[PDB]
Design a binder for this molecule. Structure first.
Ligand SMILES: CCCCCCCCCCCCCCCCCC(=O)O[C@@H](COC(=O)CCCCCCCCCCCCCCC)COP(=O)(O)OCCN
Length: 284
């Protein structure tokens, strides 16, 4: 017996404005409004990789999202979802994922004009497949728009109005592209490794079906997550990532040149961290 009105009433009396954990949600900037699109509707951003799946009460996030939509959700609006560097540590669960469908007034769902998903990656696609039963409503919908490059965003949201997180923008500068590479797995597929100053981006060069739509799957591995860099052969090199299990092996004509480039970034981070040395070793 849960509806949009009871949830709204419950939070109000269960006062949360002075919790000192509801305030931090604003500074963290998980959900905020910025700019307007060509059609003239306001645009809201959702930074997906700022939510830790077990550190705050889930109901607080819903209330914060709701409280910033009341003045606007009576008319059409648009949402930009930023999935940069999203992983299993910031997922929703079935108990908490199904709440999002039964908490807002029924017309709030209809006013959503379009959705712009940004920087999808492999984990998200697998996450969608597992929960495909719930997300059947979104299957094949025409309101989902997938962005392939930052330039395409200009068409829908005009430049000088887009406000993405400062971190997200920094991940598209000083790039060192290596086109035509190939990824070695159970089923290989073209990729294009890029090695910026801070992190390594494995941008797939082939479109794949996500929620019934073809799209590219860009993946980002940060320096701190890089553990092993080796060159088995000039044809192939292998990378090991923390907590990801099996290492990733790729084939390129100049793997040694690419392998050298990654080492430079890793070495600089080693100097960057001030801590002398960690204590003990984690074993699984
Ligand atoms: C109603 C307004 C909702 C505003 C939400 C703002 C915050 C965005 C957060 C997006 C990620 C987390 C929530 C994802 C589930 C949202 C489910 C939902 O509300 O879906 C309905 C409305 O959705 C929308 O209008 C916008 C959908 C947002 C984008 C969804 C992306 C899905 C792709 C995978 C996301 C993986 C996220 C991983 C964890 C962060 C679909 O329409 P319907 O016909 O089923 O509704 C009638 C139900 N009685």
């Amino acid at each position: 017996n849960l509806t949009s009105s009871k949830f709204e009433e419950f939070m109000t009396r269960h006062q949360v404005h002075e919790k000192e954990e509801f305030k931090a949600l604003k500074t963290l900037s998980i959900f905020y409004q910025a700019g307007t699109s060509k059609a003239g509707n306001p645009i809201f951003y959702y930074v997906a990789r700022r939510f830790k799946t077990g550190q705050i009460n889930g109901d607080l996030l819903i209330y914060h999202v709701l409280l910033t939509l009341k003045p606007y959700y009576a008319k059409p609006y648009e949402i930009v979802v930023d999935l940069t560097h999203t992983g299993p540590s910031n997922r929703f669960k079935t108990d908490f994922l199904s709440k999002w469908f039964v908490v807002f007034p029924g017309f709030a769902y209809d006013n959503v004009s379009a959705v712009y998903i940004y920087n999808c990656n492999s984990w998200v696609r697998e996450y969608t497949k597992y929960h495909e039963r719930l997300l059947t409503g979104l299957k094949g919908s025409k309101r989902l728009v997938f962005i392939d490059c930052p330039g395409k965003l200009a068409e829908h949201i005009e430049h000088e109005q887009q406000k993405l997180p400062a971190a997200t923008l920094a991940l598209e500068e000083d790039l060192k592209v290596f086109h035509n590479a190939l990824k070695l797995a159970h089923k290989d597929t073209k990729v294009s490794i890029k090695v910026g100053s801070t992190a390594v981006q494995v941008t797939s060069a082939e479109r794949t079906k996500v929620l019934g739509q073809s799209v590219f799957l860009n993946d980002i591995y940060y320096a701190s997550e890089i553990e092993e860099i080796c060159l088995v052969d000039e044809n192939q090199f292998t990378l090991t990532i923390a907590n990801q299990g099996t290492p990733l092996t790729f084939m390129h004509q100049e793997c040694e040149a690419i392998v050298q480039s990654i080492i430079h970034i890793r070495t600089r981070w080693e100097l960057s961290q001030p801590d002398s040395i960690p204590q003990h070793t984690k074993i699984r």
